[PDB]
Design an enzyme around this catalytic site. Structure first.
Site, PDB file in Angstrom:
ATOM      1  N   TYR A 105       0.627  -1.011  -0.129  1.00  0.00           N
ATOM      2  CA  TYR A 105      -0.051  -0.021   0.134  1.00  0.00           C
ATOM      3  C   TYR A 105       0.860   1.315  -0.127  1.00  0.00           C
ATOM      4  O   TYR A 105       1.971   1.292   0.751  1.00  0.00           O
ATOM      5  CB  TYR A 105      -0.818  -0.111   1.242  1.00  0.00           C
ATOM      6  CG  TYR A 105      -2.224  -0.991   0.906  1.00  0.00           C
ATOM      7  CD1 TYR A 105      -2.047  -2.318   1.378  1.00  0.00           C
ATOM      8  CD2 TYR A 105      -3.450  -0.525   0.768  1.00  0.00           C
ATOM      9  CE1 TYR A 105      -3.203  -3.215   1.734  1.00  0.00           C
ATOM     10  CE2 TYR A 105      -4.539  -1.203   0.885  1.00  0.00           C
ATOM     11  CZ  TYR A 105      -4.315  -2.625   1.148  1.00  0.00           C
ATOM     12  OH  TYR A 105      -5.508  -3.401   1.284  1.00  0.00           O
ATOM     13  N   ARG A 154      -4.122 -11.688   3.524  1.00  0.00           N
ATOM     14  CA  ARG A 154      -5.569 -11.330   3.025  1.00  0.00           C
ATOM     15  C   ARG A 154      -5.586 -11.626   1.621  1.00  0.00           C
ATOM     16  O   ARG A 154      -4.363 -11.595   0.798  1.00  0.00           O
ATOM     17  CB  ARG A 154      -5.467  -9.779   3.115  1.00  0.00           C
ATOM     18  CG  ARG A 154      -5.569  -9.211   4.450  1.00  0.00           C
ATOM     19  CD  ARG A 154      -6.914  -9.175   5.455  1.00  0.00           C
ATOM     20  NE  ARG A 154      -7.960  -9.506   4.628  1.00  0.00           N
ATOM     21  CZ  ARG A 154      -8.851  -8.872   4.213  1.00  0.00           C
ATOM     22  NH1 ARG A 154      -8.761  -7.162   4.223  1.00  0.00           N
ATOM     23  NH2 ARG A 154     -10.031  -9.222   3.660  1.00  0.00           N
TER      24      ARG A 154
END
Ligand SMILES: O=C(O)c1ccc(O)[n+]([O-])c1
Ligand SMILES: O=C(O)c1ccc(O)[n+]([O-])c1
Ligand SMILES: O=C(O)c1ccc(O)[n+]([O-])c1
Ligand SMILES: O=C(O)c1ccc(O)[n+]([O-])c1
Ligand SMILES: [Fe+3]
Ligand SMILES: [Fe+3]
Ligand SMILES: [Fe+3]
Ligand SMILES: [Fe+3]
EC number: 1.13.11.3
Lengths: 233, 200, 233, 200, 233, 200, 200
Positions: A105, A154
């Protein structure tokens, strides 16, 4: 100004994930212990902002151009936003954010060892059209390791935020990709007790919407709380 | 019975929500137009106020990655839904807690009185939705003002909370910041003094 | 020198894809029309090279360092090489090649618009150990559009080459990734008549081999022609 | 009946095989050691020769992305399996056809005779495996020499081909390149003059 | 001294019983309310004691002789200790304790009205062999009433303790007996959510290991966390 | 995905664990060789210390039937796995809480520094596993020392604990017992001041 | 994946196709308005040409029951979709091969240049669809002109055809008929000189 002309079908709290889902470690300390207090719908709850006049940039919805080219799988993510009655939700704000191809990210707090992509930001926004349609052009995100259990990953996902007609309809969720094997092992996914509910979070491969020799497409439709007029009040 | 299409299930906003909805905070460049924490322009009618607070977890520890959304009427008790950066007042705003101090702020005006569906006036209030990592589905609350005691005593909404002591959790404490009228509204997610969260 | 002491189980040519598989366009002009001529096994066919003494570089099997860090999903590709009898094949050569995270190959002839990754090559080699085990470290490749039908996309895959104990056992194949929705649609995949055989080419997510907070792993076992000794010959 | 584990199914090498097995051709940097097309060092015993050829598809068009593997005996009809660049001669080699001209070449020596399983001698031959885009499972063929007619006539393998005509498709045509002994071996995958391919 | 060469497959915490299982009353006040903090494996966690040199007595493992003959069903309890990969765990410490034929324990705190057996102590220890096998000779224990619900009875069981290669593999469990109707009613048993997990704690009658006209035998295999070598760390 | 054989499921040790693992305490005869609470003999190199503590339940009540296992490095920061009663020092030991006072004790030496997998030194610590009736699966914790404040601040493990306030739950308090260096380490299973437990 | 409604499956036109689509040829009375083989009226702008050809099967035998549909741009490289018999030029036409000689003819103009989707110019061409008995799904092809060699060499469409020799199959040969500019375009459904057919 806004007016109290609608009622929203009551949320199903057994459908959505519950507040306390222990396998999702952080939920432990961030879940209310008292019961939510039910209140009748009022103008406060049945109105919301309309973003029709927000001045969107030309590339707001295109993650390939909005931050050279990003490295990763080029895909379009398109779908429609309807209410529970099946009615389209036109001129509504749809926002999204996600990691890069490697699961990193573009955020300070992100210390994952996968590198950043010089040409990728990871944010987009789009106002649905007349028919409740929206679309984004991006790259498919990578899975990301996270500090939950000692080996939690995830599944690749895209974060979504949707306004709808009122604050009563405002929703935040995540999109998952069809066939990802990490899906069934995720504690966050598993906060949803009903497997049928999980299915609604899965984007399907859309060959029909693909650009041959260029990019693939995924379809993701969103259903917001049903909107009806008041009666016999 | 009649079954409708089911609503798309909620998921936590996660730790990086800022990247999508609080660009500055993520430490990323913003776009031309961003929805943020300044609801009123200095020349907006009504009583200008500064709102601030902290958010605590069940352990009494600060929640520093919290994201908040507000919805309130203007000084005339009117909901301005047509969002425009040009307007002197917007009913909708966004804020987030500092990764350091962990305090959020909002620049607005004190909302006027709105009536409920039955025609009964509600005490001045601000609607709040709280999002964050570890929050599967966002929490709804209302911000009330300690100087509107008379109104508060008669709010049809406040009056729905069975325990009088729980009503106190919704009342913001008036103060002053740099000679400006400020109200502090701390949020306790869990435990001692837990804030009333609503379902509607 | 090598010696003729082994025999190899005749290949099942109904299990493997046939030569002419019309949906895979190029097989049309590139498949013989006459029948193969069957011949008895001799030393010519029952022996092959042993690469035990090849001079392998330290990062030969590590696509993450053998070419900064590549952008993309970090993963381990490991498994074992056994024969039809279930016996390990030690000290055998396994080579692999693939495209980057975006589906771009580092080849002259590749004109796909997804960009090349400056830190990525896409080639590896590894000699199996005493137990027939191999491993590679790489990034998961992206699907690639190709000129077959008007909107054909190869599922994400890694090309493999395995020597085995003889030229009779040498094989070239591809590894696919568990749950990838393009698998069922690819004409190259479909060159394989039995769905059971297709399953054999699918790498399974292996959470057990993963390095927490670092990379995921995929398990891909390989089976070569069973070897036996001659008898009553 | 008894069923063993099934062999892993083959798949085409694809158009990009080079990147993995013919680094130079891919137009990429090579590693310290590479398996290539020079089987014998100038000081290798035996008759040094140059082998070359083209590959045709069923339309008579050149296959410019083909990749071949070779396996042969040395001059003494001996198979040298311990592959090593230091070796004066290696029984194994690899070659590819030019994306341009589309010709492949190998540098080696004329293999000596080996016998079959029954103890009958086979004519000097080179075993070849062909790979390429559009080839689902590699093709096996053998190269024979035109100057070994007497031996060729007796070959137990060559004698297995029912039609004498097809046997000719396996005989490489002796020539000279830059005053060096060369042999030309064209491979026709399909149609007129289709090359015999084997199963074993 | 011990070296950091191994990694241990992460524990499946939905397989093992949770901390808070309200029916087992004691668990309520003795279960953490905070989530466990995951930590990377270090030499501290991947090493553990080796008891090859502990001086074991000759009847350490024979509860029939190690304390006249005890009264009760004479049985051999034998089995194998392996890891998740199916690899045997040689020279590992296996400790067991249990009640007598009447369900009475030789512990001061045991007030059950069933009498002690003058010839029975109820403790054994065995070091697994080169192949992961262990064996004990004892008498089958009796069910035991306990102050949980008003009429709670533990099925006949033997308490077990297993060291393994490290502190990460160390486990304490209980063996139950094939067909025991008390099994499904036990709140401690039901601490385990998966019926398949329950199965793993049931020892099977083993007529093959019995000594005719002497004693019967039960088979109980134990599986410790899989052990692997570190890679690309 | 790939699935291995599942690990045998844990069960509580139960109230009578002592008969199996702490013979003395069960009030039963011991064997020639028992694994107990004396890790170091008087002649063992390092700083000889005494460890003591109590275990508390969520009600604040003493847990008088707990069983503990400890694993620690020697004075040089070395793990000694070869368990022998003849050794001057053993890295492993066992202890239990008294049915009376409900306090456990260990006789050992202060452990030397050990590096994590990444080559970063961890502050001196003792690995502890807690077992008892009412505990389905054993609790893993770590004992750190108050007089290693400088080392403690930099431990990569201690540093993984999100909230600083929780880190303090892991630090034993230096005292003296009969003029000897001792550290008190209380375990709070649940509630106010709950001790951090790890998963690895 | 997402599945839409399946398209209606195709079926051969069969041998009596003429009754429905080529009235005259069926030897049946026509209706007032028929879509036939004259795309341009004498007064249509551009260079007036005659198109003629034969259709061959895999055996080199004439296909005398074929039916063809043509789509082309006008002299300005413009597609005229509003079909009207009054029009001076229609972009769409129909033709068929004679039950005798088996030759089709079209009366039109040389089409202007149109750009592809990427903005690159395509060489002048006529889009052709071929139907008949024995053809389950219609055959798509393009007719290019030999007198446009320059444009042809740069055609993004022609260039997609891998083999240059195949490209030739698409070029009509300029001739003259009764002193009129004509181009001959023979179709070879199968075998030696098989015309290139497209998918889109
Ligand atoms: O801790 C979380 O809630 C979390 C961590 C990573 C991620 O990607 N999302 O979405 C959520
Ligand atoms: O044309 C082919 O055969 C082909 C093209 C692309 C690709 O990736 N693979 O594997 C094969
Ligand atoms: O309270 C307990 O946990 C308990 C009581 C008796 C017994 O036999 N076991 O095994 C356990
Ligand atoms: O030969 C044919 O294709 C044929 C013959 C008769 C008929 O009615 N249709 O439809 C087709
Ligand atoms: Fe995320
Ligand atoms: Fe490929
Ligand atoms: Fe017991
Ligand atoms: Fe018909």
């Amino acid at each position: 100004p806004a007016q109290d002309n609608s009622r929203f079908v009551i949320r199903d709290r057994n459908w959505h994930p519950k507040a306390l889902t222990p396998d999702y470690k952080t939920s432990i300390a961030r879940s209310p212990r008292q019961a939510l207090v039910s209140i009748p719908q009022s103008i406060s709850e049945t109105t919301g902002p309309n973003f029709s006049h927000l001045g969107f940039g030309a590339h707001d919805h295109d993650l390939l151009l909005n931050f050279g080219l990003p490295i990763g799988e080029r895909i379009i993510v398109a779908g429609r936003v309807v209410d529970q009655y099946g009615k389209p939700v036109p001129n509504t704000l749809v926002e999204m954010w996600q990691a890069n191809a490697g699961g990193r990210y573009r955020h300070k707090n992100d210390r994952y060892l996968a590198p950043l992509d010089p040409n990728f930001g990871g944010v987009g926004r789009c106002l649905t059209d007349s028919d409740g349609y929206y679309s984004f052009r991006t790259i498919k995100p990578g899975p990301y390791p996270w500090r939950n259990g000692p080996n939690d990953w995830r599944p690749a996902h895209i974060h979504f935020g949707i306004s709808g007609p009122s604050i009563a309809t405002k929703l935040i969720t995540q999109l998952y990709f069809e066939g990802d094997p990490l899906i069934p092992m995720c504690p966050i996914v598993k906060s949803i007790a009903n497997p049928e509910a999980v299915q609604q979070l899965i984007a399907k491969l859309d060959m029909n919407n693909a650009n041959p020799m260029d990019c693939l497409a995924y379809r993701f439709d969103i259903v917001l709380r049903g909107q009806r007029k008041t009666h016999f009040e | 019975p009649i079954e409708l299409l089911p609503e798309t299930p909620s998921q936590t906003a996660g730790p990086y929500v800022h990247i999508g909805l609080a660009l500055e905070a993520a430490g990323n460049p913003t776009r031309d137009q961003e929805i943020w924490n300044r609801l009123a322009k200095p020349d907006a009618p009504g009583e200008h106020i500064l709102l601030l607070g902290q958010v605590y977890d069940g352990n009494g520890h600060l929640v520093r990655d919290s994201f908040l959304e507000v919805w309130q009427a203007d000084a005339n008790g009117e909901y301005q839904d047509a969002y425009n950066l040009e307007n002197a007042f917007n009913s909708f705003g966004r804020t987030a807690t500092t990764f350091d101090a962990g305090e959020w702020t909002l620049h607005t005006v004190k909302p006027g009185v709105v009536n409920n569906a039955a025609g009964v006036p509600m005490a001045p209030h601000i609607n709040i939705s709280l999002f964050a990592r570890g929050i599967n589905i966002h929490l709804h609350t209302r911000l009330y003002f300690d100087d509107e005691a008379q109104a508060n005593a008669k709010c049809p909404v406040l009056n729905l909370i069975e325990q009088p002591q729980r009503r106190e959790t919704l009342i913001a404490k008036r103060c002053e910041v740099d000679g400006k009228t400020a109200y502090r509204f701390d949020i306790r997610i869990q435990g001692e003094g837990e804030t009333v969260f609503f379902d509607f």
